[PDB]
Protein backbone atom coordinates (compact mmCIF):
# COMPACT_ATOMS: atom_id res chain seq x y z
CA UNK A 1 0.00 0.00 0.00
CA UNK A 2 1.42 3.31 -1.20
CA UNK A 3 -0.22 6.69 -1.69
CA UNK A 4 1.00 8.66 -4.69
CA UNK A 5 2.04 12.32 -4.43
CA UNK A 6 0.03 14.93 -6.39
CA UNK A 7 2.48 15.78 -9.15
CA UNK A 8 -0.44 15.89 -11.61
CA UNK A 9 -4.20 16.15 -11.16
CA UNK A 10 -4.64 12.42 -11.82
CA UNK A 11 -2.18 11.10 -9.22
CA UNK A 12 -3.80 13.14 -6.43
CA UNK A 13 -5.94 10.19 -5.29
CA UNK A 14 -4.18 7.08 -6.62
CA UNK A 15 -3.72 4.65 -3.74
CA UNK A 16 -1.65 1.83 -5.16
CA UNK A 17 -1.17 -1.70 -3.82
CA UNK A 18 2.34 -2.96 -4.61
CA UNK A 19 3.71 -6.31 -3.47
CA UNK A 20 7.46 -6.65 -3.87
CA UNK A 21 7.60 -10.43 -3.46
CA UNK A 22 5.40 -10.96 -6.49
CA UNK A 23 7.31 -12.50 -9.38
CA UNK A 24 8.99 -10.17 -11.87
CA UNK A 25 7.83 -11.22 -15.31
CA UNK A 26 7.58 -14.31 -17.55
CA UNK A 27 4.58 -16.30 -16.28
CA UNK A 28 4.78 -20.05 -16.63
CA UNK A 29 4.25 -20.50 -20.35
CA UNK A 30 3.03 -24.16 -20.66
CA UNK A 31 0.04 -23.31 -18.48
CA UNK A 32 -1.37 -20.13 -20.06
CA UNK A 33 -3.86 -19.96 -22.90
CA UNK A 34 -5.30 -17.34 -25.22
CA UNK A 35 -8.26 -15.23 -24.14
CA UNK A 36 -9.98 -12.58 -26.27
CA UNK A 37 -12.47 -10.02 -24.93
CA UNK A 38 -16.22 -10.11 -25.54
CA UNK A 39 -17.21 -6.50 -25.05
CA UNK A 40 -20.12 -7.83 -23.01
CA UNK A 41 -21.56 -9.23 -26.18
CA UNK A 42 -23.57 -12.36 -26.94
CA UNK A 43 -23.22 -14.86 -29.76
CA UNK A 44 -26.07 -12.81 -31.19
CA UNK A 45 -23.67 -9.87 -31.09
CA UNK A 46 -25.89 -8.04 -28.63
CA UNK A 47 -24.67 -6.19 -25.56
CA UNK A 48 -26.02 -8.45 -22.83
CA UNK A 49 -23.92 -7.09 -19.99
CA UNK A 50 -23.38 -3.39 -20.14
CA UNK A 51 -20.37 -1.24 -19.29
CA UNK A 52 -17.78 -3.67 -20.69
CA UNK A 53 -15.25 -2.81 -23.37
CA UNK A 54 -11.59 -2.08 -23.88
CA UNK A 55 -8.85 -2.84 -21.40
CA UNK A 56 -5.49 -4.55 -21.66
CA UNK A 57 -4.70 -7.79 -23.49
CA UNK A 58 -4.74 -10.72 -21.06
CA UNK A 59 -3.74 -14.38 -21.06
CA UNK A 60 -5.84 -16.90 -19.14
CA UNK A 61 -3.97 -18.80 -16.42
CA UNK A 62 -4.97 -22.45 -16.01
CA UNK A 63 -5.36 -22.23 -12.25
CA UNK A 64 -6.29 -25.56 -10.68
CA UNK A 65 -9.57 -25.41 -8.78
CA UNK A 66 -9.80 -29.17 -8.35
CA UNK A 67 -6.48 -29.92 -6.55
CA UNK A 68 -6.50 -33.56 -7.59
CA UNK A 69 -2.91 -34.74 -7.00
CA UNK A 70 -3.29 -36.56 -3.68
CA UNK A 71 -0.32 -37.61 -1.60
CA UNK A 72 2.15 -35.90 -3.95
CA UNK A 73 3.82 -32.98 -2.12
CA UNK A 74 3.97 -29.66 -3.94
CA UNK A 75 6.54 -27.02 -3.14
CA UNK A 76 5.62 -23.42 -3.96
CA UNK A 77 7.88 -21.78 -6.51
CA UNK A 78 6.65 -18.20 -6.63
CA UNK A 79 3.54 -16.07 -6.24
CA UNK A 80 2.48 -14.28 -9.41
CA UNK A 81 0.10 -11.60 -10.53
CA UNK A 82 -3.07 -12.88 -12.21
CA UNK A 83 -4.86 -10.43 -14.55
CA UNK A 84 -8.04 -12.51 -14.50
CA UNK A 85 -8.86 -12.12 -10.82
CA UNK A 86 -8.25 -9.99 -7.77
CA UNK A 87 -6.40 -12.74 -5.89
CA UNK A 88 -2.83 -13.87 -6.39
CA UNK A 89 -1.84 -17.22 -7.85
CA UNK A 90 0.93 -19.49 -6.63
CA UNK A 91 3.02 -21.67 -8.90
CA UNK A 92 3.31 -25.09 -7.28
CA UNK A 93 5.87 -27.69 -8.32
CA UNK A 94 4.79 -31.20 -7.44
CA UNK A 95 7.21 -33.96 -6.51
CA UNK A 96 7.15 -35.31 -10.10
CA UNK A 97 7.82 -32.21 -12.18
CA UNK A 98 4.25 -31.07 -12.77
CA UNK A 99 3.84 -27.35 -12.36
CA UNK A 100 0.33 -26.10 -11.59
CA UNK A 101 -1.29 -22.86 -10.48
CA UNK A 102 -3.56 -22.61 -7.47
CA UNK A 103 -5.07 -19.62 -5.78
CA UNK A 104 -2.45 -18.29 -3.41
CA UNK A 105 -3.34 -18.23 0.29
CA UNK A 106 -2.20 -15.60 2.79
CA UNK A 107 1.44 -16.20 3.80
CA UNK A 108 3.07 -18.36 1.06
CA UNK A 109 6.43 -17.83 -0.75
CA UNK A 110 8.38 -21.15 -0.94
CA UNK A 111 6.39 -23.24 1.57
CA UNK A 112 5.36 -26.88 1.29
CA UNK A 113 1.77 -28.08 0.95
CA UNK A 114 -0.10 -31.22 -0.19
CA UNK A 115 -3.85 -31.74 -0.91
CA UNK A 116 -4.99 -35.26 0.17
CA UNK A 117 -7.49 -37.37 2.16
CA UNK A 118 -5.64 -36.52 5.43
CA UNK A 119 -3.02 -33.73 5.07
CA UNK A 120 -1.60 -31.36 7.72
CA UNK A 121 -4.19 -28.64 8.69
CA UNK A 122 -1.71 -26.20 10.37
CA UNK A 123 -0.25 -25.32 6.95
CA UNK A 124 -2.78 -22.94 5.33
CA UNK A 125 -3.01 -23.96 1.65
CA UNK A 126 -3.65 -27.71 2.02
CA UNK A 127 -6.77 -28.79 0.07
CA UNK A 128 -8.89 -31.31 1.90
CA UNK A 129 -12.35 -32.89 1.97
CA UNK A 130 -14.88 -31.14 4.18
CA UNK A 131 -15.43 -34.29 6.27
CA UNK A 132 -11.96 -34.14 7.83
CA UNK A 133 -11.53 -30.40 8.28
CA UNK A 134 -11.95 -29.29 11.92
CA UNK A 135 -15.09 -27.34 12.75
CA UNK A 136 -14.47 -23.67 13.49
CA UNK A 137 -11.64 -23.27 11.00
CA UNK A 138 -11.58 -20.72 8.20
CA UNK A 139 -11.41 -22.17 4.69
CA UNK A 140 -11.55 -20.89 1.13
CA UNK A 141 -11.96 -22.31 -2.36
CA UNK A 142 -14.83 -24.62 -1.51
CA UNK A 143 -16.12 -27.04 -4.11
CA UNK A 144 -19.85 -27.22 -4.50
CA UNK A 145 -20.04 -30.47 -6.49
CA UNK A 146 -17.36 -33.19 -6.09
CA UNK A 147 -15.10 -33.01 -9.13
CA UNK A 148 -16.42 -29.63 -10.26
CA UNK A 149 -13.64 -27.57 -8.68
CA UNK A 150 -13.66 -24.63 -6.32
CA UNK A 151 -16.45 -22.13 -6.72
CA UNK A 152 -17.06 -20.40 -3.40
CA UNK A 153 -14.76 -17.99 -1.50
CA UNK A 154 -12.01 -17.41 -4.02
CA UNK A 155 -11.77 -13.61 -4.45
CA UNK A 156 -8.98 -11.67 -2.79
CA UNK A 157 -9.00 -12.05 0.97
CA UNK A 158 -12.20 -14.10 0.86
CA UNK A 159 -12.97 -16.79 3.38
CA UNK A 160 -15.72 -18.89 4.87
CA UNK A 161 -15.91 -20.33 8.37
CA UNK A 162 -16.82 -23.98 8.85
CA UNK A 163 -19.40 -23.71 11.60
CA UNK A 164 -21.31 -26.98 11.98
CA UNK A 165 -21.54 -30.59 10.81
CA UNK A 166 -24.26 -33.22 10.51
CA UNK A 167 -24.89 -36.18 8.24
CA UNK A 168 -23.37 -36.17 4.76
CA UNK A 169 -23.39 -32.36 4.73
CA UNK A 170 -21.50 -29.58 6.45
CA UNK A 171 -22.62 -26.07 7.33
CA UNK A 172 -20.36 -23.10 6.72
CA UNK A 173 -20.93 -19.37 7.09
CA UNK A 174 -20.05 -17.50 3.94
CA UNK A 175 -18.37 -14.12 3.54
CA UNK A 176 -21.76 -12.87 2.31
CA UNK A 177 -23.16 -13.48 5.78
CA UNK A 178 -25.37 -16.38 4.80
CA UNK A 179 -25.30 -19.91 6.17
CA UNK A 180 -24.87 -22.49 3.42
CA UNK A 181 -25.18 -26.25 3.70
CA UNK A 182 -22.46 -27.83 1.52
CA UNK A 183 -21.80 -31.53 0.87
CA UNK A 184 -18.91 -32.98 2.83
CA UNK A 185 -17.46 -35.12 0.04
CA UNK A 186 -16.31 -32.03 -1.81
CA UNK A 187 -12.99 -30.30 -1.22
CA UNK A 188 -11.83 -27.06 0.35
CA UNK A 189 -8.49 -25.39 1.02
CA UNK A 190 -7.48 -24.44 4.56
CA UNK A 191 -6.86 -20.75 5.09
CA UNK A 192 -7.71 -17.37 3.57
CA UNK A 193 -6.95 -15.77 0.23
CA UNK A 194 -3.84 -13.74 -0.29
CA UNK A 195 -4.44 -10.22 -1.62
CA UNK A 196 -6.62 -9.04 1.24
CA UNK A 197 -5.51 -5.39 0.96
CA UNK A 198 -7.18 -5.11 -2.46
CA UNK A 199 -10.13 -3.22 -0.99
CA UNK A 200 -7.79 -0.41 0.06
CA UNK A 201 -6.58 0.67 -3.37
CA UNK A 202 -8.18 3.71 -4.95
CA UNK A 203 -8.22 4.01 -8.73
CA UNK A 204 -7.73 7.75 -8.67
CA UNK A 205 -8.67 8.63 -12.22
CA UNK A 206 -11.21 7.81 -14.91
CA UNK A 207 -8.60 6.18 -17.09
CA UNK A 208 -7.83 3.57 -14.45
CA UNK A 209 -11.37 2.27 -14.82
CA UNK A 210 -11.08 2.22 -18.59
CA UNK A 211 -8.09 -0.09 -18.69
CA UNK A 212 -9.68 -2.76 -16.55
CA UNK A 213 -12.14 -3.20 -19.39
CA UNK A 214 -14.88 -1.22 -17.66
CA UNK A 215 -16.80 1.37 -19.63
CA UNK A 216 -18.84 4.41 -18.46
CA UNK A 217 -22.23 4.26 -16.74
CA UNK A 218 -24.75 6.84 -17.90
CA UNK A 219 -27.26 6.97 -15.14
CA UNK A 220 -30.86 6.66 -16.17
CA UNK A 221 -32.09 10.07 -15.07
CA UNK A 222 -29.74 11.49 -17.71
CA UNK A 223 -31.57 9.67 -20.52
CA UNK A 224 -34.86 10.29 -22.40
CA UNK A 225 -38.21 8.51 -21.80
CA UNK A 226 -37.52 6.17 -24.72
CA UNK A 227 -34.14 5.08 -23.32
CA UNK A 228 -34.91 4.41 -19.68
CA UNK A 229 -37.90 4.43 -17.36
CA UNK A 230 -36.23 7.25 -15.37
CA UNK A 231 -37.58 9.26 -18.37
CA UNK A 232 -36.89 12.92 -19.07
CA UNK A 233 -38.48 15.98 -17.56
CA UNK A 234 -37.32 19.57 -17.54
CA UNK A 235 -34.11 20.22 -15.67
CA UNK A 236 -32.79 17.68 -13.22
CA UNK A 237 -35.75 15.51 -12.46
CA UNK A 238 -35.45 12.74 -9.94
CA UNK A 239 -37.06 9.60 -11.46
CA UNK A 240 -40.69 10.11 -10.42
CA UNK A 241 -40.99 6.32 -10.84
CA UNK A 242 -39.90 4.01 -8.13
CA UNK A 243 -36.19 3.33 -8.83
CA UNK A 244 -35.93 0.68 -11.48
CA UNK A 245 -33.60 -0.94 -14.05
CA UNK A 246 -33.53 0.02 -17.76
CA UNK A 247 -35.83 -2.98 -18.31
CA UNK A 248 -38.38 -2.24 -15.59
CA UNK A 249 -37.23 -4.37 -12.65
CA UNK A 250 -37.40 -2.60 -9.29
CA UNK A 251 -33.98 -2.09 -7.79
CA UNK A 252 -34.02 -0.67 -4.26
CA UNK A 253 -35.02 -3.64 -2.18
CA UNK A 254 -36.80 -6.11 -4.42
CA UNK A 255 -35.63 -9.72 -4.04
CA UNK A 256 -34.78 -11.51 -7.29
CA UNK A 257 -33.83 -15.05 -6.24
CA UNK A 258 -36.14 -17.66 -7.78
CA UNK A 259 -34.06 -20.83 -7.77
CA UNK A 260 -36.20 -23.26 -5.68
CA UNK A 261 -34.04 -26.29 -6.68
CA UNK A 262 -31.34 -25.30 -4.10
CA UNK A 263 -33.33 -23.59 -1.31
CA UNK A 264 -32.90 -26.47 1.13
CA UNK A 265 -29.12 -26.07 0.72
CA UNK A 266 -29.39 -22.55 2.14
CA UNK A 267 -30.01 -22.85 5.91
CA UNK A 268 -30.10 -19.04 6.57
CA UNK A 269 -30.13 -16.01 4.21
CA UNK A 270 -27.99 -12.84 4.32
CA UNK A 271 -28.79 -11.24 7.69
CA UNK B 1 17.90 -24.55 32.14
CA UNK B 2 16.16 -26.41 34.97
CA UNK B 3 12.74 -26.85 33.40
CA UNK B 4 9.80 -28.56 35.13
CA UNK B 5 7.62 -30.65 32.81
CA UNK B 6 3.93 -31.40 33.31
CA UNK B 7 1.78 -32.71 30.46
CA UNK B 8 -1.63 -34.35 30.28
CA UNK B 9 -2.96 -37.52 28.65
CA UNK B 10 -6.45 -38.77 27.96
CA UNK B 11 -7.37 -41.80 30.14
CA UNK B 12 -8.01 -43.95 27.04
CA UNK B 13 -4.51 -43.01 25.79
CA UNK B 14 -2.30 -44.01 28.74
CA UNK B 15 -1.46 -47.46 27.25
CA UNK B 16 1.42 -45.75 25.40
CA UNK B 17 2.92 -43.43 28.02
CA UNK B 18 5.75 -45.97 27.67
CA UNK B 19 6.08 -44.63 24.12
CA UNK B 20 5.28 -40.99 24.96
CA UNK B 21 8.10 -40.58 27.50
CA UNK B 22 10.93 -42.26 25.59
CA UNK B 23 10.94 -39.78 22.69
CA UNK B 24 11.39 -36.85 25.08
CA UNK B 25 14.20 -38.68 26.89
CA UNK B 26 16.17 -38.70 23.64
CA UNK B 27 14.98 -35.21 22.73
CA UNK B 28 16.97 -34.06 25.79
CA UNK B 29 20.10 -36.24 25.49
CA UNK B 30 20.89 -34.81 22.06
CA UNK B 31 21.70 -31.57 23.96
CA UNK B 32 23.42 -32.75 27.16
CA UNK B 33 20.47 -32.27 29.50
CA UNK B 34 20.64 -33.99 32.88
CA UNK B 35 17.39 -35.57 34.07
CA UNK B 36 17.04 -35.37 37.84
CA UNK B 37 13.46 -36.70 38.19
CA UNK B 38 11.19 -38.95 36.10
CA UNK B 39 7.71 -39.25 37.62
CA UNK B 40 4.45 -40.99 36.79
CA UNK B 41 1.57 -39.57 38.84
CA UNK B 42 -1.32 -41.32 40.50
CA UNK B 43 -4.29 -42.00 38.24
CA UNK B 44 -6.29 -39.31 40.01
CA UNK B 45 -9.80 -37.89 39.47
CA UNK B 46 -10.48 -34.47 37.92
CA UNK B 47 -11.73 -31.24 39.51
CA UNK B 48 -13.01 -29.62 36.30
CA UNK B 49 -14.12 -30.85 32.90
CA UNK B 50 -11.27 -30.86 30.38
CA UNK B 51 -12.28 -32.17 26.93
CA UNK B 52 -15.66 -33.06 28.55
CA UNK B 53 -14.44 -36.25 30.25
CA UNK B 54 -14.22 -37.35 33.86
CA UNK B 55 -10.77 -38.98 34.21
CA UNK B 56 -7.14 -38.16 33.33
CA UNK B 57 -3.52 -38.98 34.15
CA UNK B 58 -0.58 -36.64 34.78
CA UNK B 59 3.10 -36.86 33.77
CA UNK B 60 6.12 -35.20 35.42
CA UNK B 61 9.67 -34.85 34.10
CA UNK B 62 12.49 -32.32 34.48
CA UNK B 63 14.41 -31.04 31.44
CA UNK B 64 17.83 -29.49 31.96
CA UNK B 65 18.82 -28.56 28.40
CA UNK B 66 19.73 -25.03 27.43
CA UNK B 67 17.21 -23.85 24.82
CA UNK B 68 16.82 -26.17 21.84
CA UNK B 69 14.69 -28.89 23.47
CA UNK B 70 11.81 -26.50 24.20
CA UNK B 71 10.18 -25.64 20.86
CA UNK B 72 9.89 -29.31 19.93
CA UNK B 73 8.91 -30.13 23.52
CA UNK B 74 5.98 -27.80 22.94
CA UNK B 75 5.04 -28.60 19.38
CA UNK B 76 4.92 -32.37 19.53
CA UNK B 77 1.97 -31.97 21.94
CA UNK B 78 0.84 -28.35 21.51
CA UNK B 79 -0.02 -28.74 17.81
CA UNK B 80 -1.52 -32.23 17.60
CA UNK B 81 -1.54 -34.92 20.30
CA UNK B 82 -3.48 -35.81 23.46
CA UNK B 83 -2.18 -33.04 25.76
CA UNK B 84 -4.15 -30.03 26.98
CA UNK B 85 -3.68 -27.00 29.26
CA UNK B 86 -0.12 -27.33 30.57
CA UNK B 87 2.42 -24.93 32.08
CA UNK B 88 6.14 -25.15 31.56
CA UNK B 89 7.39 -23.43 34.76
CA UNK B 90 11.23 -23.50 34.68
CA UNK B 91 13.22 -24.08 37.89
CA UNK B 92 16.67 -23.11 39.17
CA UNK B 93 17.96 -26.26 40.93
CA UNK B 94 17.32 -30.00 41.08
CA UNK B 95 14.90 -31.99 43.27
CA UNK B 96 14.50 -35.66 44.19
CA UNK B 97 10.97 -37.10 44.27
CA UNK B 98 7.31 -36.55 45.06
CA UNK B 99 4.02 -38.52 44.84
CA UNK B 100 4.80 -39.98 48.29
Amino acid sequence: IVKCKPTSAGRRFVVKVVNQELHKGAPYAPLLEKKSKSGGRNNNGRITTRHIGGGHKQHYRLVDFRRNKDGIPAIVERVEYDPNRTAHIALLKYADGERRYIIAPKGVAAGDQLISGIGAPIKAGNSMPLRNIPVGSTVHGIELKPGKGAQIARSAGASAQLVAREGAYVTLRLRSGEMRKVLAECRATLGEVSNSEHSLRSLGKAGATRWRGVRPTVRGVAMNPVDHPHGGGEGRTSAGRHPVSPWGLQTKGKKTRSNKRTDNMIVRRRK
Amino acid sequence: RHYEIVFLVHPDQSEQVGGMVERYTKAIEEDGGKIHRLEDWGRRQLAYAINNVHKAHYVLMNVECSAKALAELEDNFRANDAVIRNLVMRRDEAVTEQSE
Binding site: - | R44, L46, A47, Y48, I50, Y58, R85, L87, Q98
Partner: protein, 56 residues
Protein backbone atom coordinates in the same frame (compact mmCIF):
# COMPACT_ATOMS: atom_id res chain seq x y z
CA UNK C 1 10.11 -24.79 53.99
CA UNK C 2 9.84 -23.92 50.28
CA UNK C 3 6.09 -24.14 49.71
CA UNK C 4 4.61 -25.45 46.45
CA UNK C 5 1.51 -27.27 45.21
CA UNK C 6 2.83 -30.84 45.51
CA UNK C 7 1.99 -30.91 49.24
CA UNK C 8 -1.80 -30.87 48.90
CA UNK C 9 -2.99 -31.49 52.48
CA UNK C 10 -1.05 -28.44 53.68
CA UNK C 11 -2.75 -26.13 51.15
CA UNK C 12 -6.11 -27.93 51.53
CA UNK C 13 -6.10 -26.80 55.18
CA UNK C 14 -6.53 -23.29 53.74
CA UNK C 15 -8.72 -24.29 50.77
CA UNK C 16 -12.30 -23.25 51.53
CA UNK C 17 -15.06 -25.86 51.37
CA UNK C 18 -16.73 -23.60 48.79
CA UNK C 19 -13.63 -23.79 46.58
CA UNK C 20 -12.01 -20.48 47.49
CA UNK C 21 -8.78 -19.35 49.14
CA UNK C 22 -8.70 -17.84 52.64
CA UNK C 23 -7.32 -14.36 53.43
CA UNK C 24 -4.91 -13.57 56.24
CA UNK C 25 -7.81 -12.14 58.24
CA UNK C 26 -9.50 -15.56 58.44
CA UNK C 27 -6.60 -17.92 59.22
CA UNK C 28 -3.13 -16.92 60.34
CA UNK C 29 -0.48 -17.48 57.70
CA UNK C 30 2.33 -15.12 56.78
CA UNK C 31 1.71 -12.04 54.66
CA UNK C 32 5.20 -12.60 53.26
CA UNK C 33 3.93 -15.79 51.64
CA UNK C 34 0.30 -14.67 51.20
CA UNK C 35 1.51 -13.20 47.89
CA UNK C 36 3.32 -16.50 47.14
CA UNK C 37 0.69 -19.03 48.31
CA UNK C 38 -2.12 -17.86 45.95
CA UNK C 39 0.23 -18.30 42.96
CA UNK C 40 1.04 -21.86 44.03
CA UNK C 41 -2.68 -22.34 44.79
CA UNK C 42 -3.51 -21.62 41.14
CA UNK C 43 -0.98 -24.20 39.92
CA UNK C 44 -2.77 -27.02 41.73
CA UNK C 45 -5.98 -25.37 40.52
CA UNK C 46 -4.58 -25.30 36.99
CA UNK C 47 -3.31 -28.90 37.21
CA UNK C 48 -6.84 -29.97 38.35
CA UNK C 49 -6.14 -30.64 42.04
CA UNK C 50 -8.72 -28.05 43.21
CA UNK C 51 -12.06 -26.99 41.69
CA UNK C 52 -13.04 -23.66 40.15
CA UNK C 53 -16.72 -23.97 41.07
CA UNK C 54 -18.11 -25.66 44.17
CA UNK C 55 -20.54 -27.87 42.21
CA UNK C 56 -18.56 -30.78 40.70
Amino acid sequence: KEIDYKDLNTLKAYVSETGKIVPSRITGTKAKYQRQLATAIKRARYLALLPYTDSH
